Design a protein around this ligand. Structure first.
Ligand SMILES: Nc1nc2c(ncn2[C@@H]2O[C@H](COP(=O)(O)OP(=O)(O)O)[C@@H](O)[C@H]2O)c(=O)[nH]1
Ligand SMILES: [Mg+2]
Length: 158
């Protein structure tokens, strides 16, 4: 059975912790500060027969060490959060081998009426650095099951 390590990256306030809490426990709160009550949480999967042990890491070399995939999140309502995405890529590449499966993720899509990131622009940067781009809303639970499933499959292929 497959054992994968996945790290969450990006600026504060974008929804990194909400994403892990939503995926792993189906909880979401916008009333107080959320903090992961562990270094990582475990999720088990079955993909076309085979089992997958997933360890999802969050933070408020030990962190980067032994990672197979990476989830780099920005906030669709906030252009600075996106423009800082490139700093994290040019830190992920310093820490780890360019063999790691990277996701770039536009979170908070329930707030579309307040969008400030260009979809074209975001998807273009993703392709140029070899990664895939995804849209999520932790609040409404949209796009998240698909993000983790596709990442798991990508890590299985290489
Ligand atoms: N409307 C909306 N709010 C969100 C979403 N995801 C997170 N939030 C809220 O944005 C705030 C920051 O979230 P947090 O998970 O702590 O971001 P982090 O610093 O990257 O870990 C919290 O109030 C969340 O409840 C979303 O998809 N939609
Ligand atoms: Mg957090």
């Amino acid at each position: 059975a497959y054992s994968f390590k996945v790290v969450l990256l990006g600026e504060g306030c974008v929804g990194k912790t909400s994403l892990v809490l939503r995926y792993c426990e189906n909880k979401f709160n916008d009333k107080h500060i959320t903090t992961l009550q562990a270094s990582f949480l475990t999720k088990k999967l079955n993909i076309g027969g085979k089992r997958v042990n997933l360890a999802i890491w969050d933070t408020a070399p030990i962190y980067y060490r032994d990672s197979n995939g990476a989830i780099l999140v920005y906030d669709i309502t906030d252009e600075d959060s996106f423009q800082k995405v490139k700093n994290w890529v040019k830190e992920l590449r310093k820490m780890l081998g360019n063999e790691i499966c990277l996701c770039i993720v536009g979170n908070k899509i329930d707030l579309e009426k307040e969008r400030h990131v260009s979809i074209q622009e975001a998807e273009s940067y993703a392709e140029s650095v070899g990664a895939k781009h995804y849209h999520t809303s932790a609040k409404q639970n949209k796009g998240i099951e698909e993000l983790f499933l596709d990442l798991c499959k990508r890590m299985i292929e290489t």
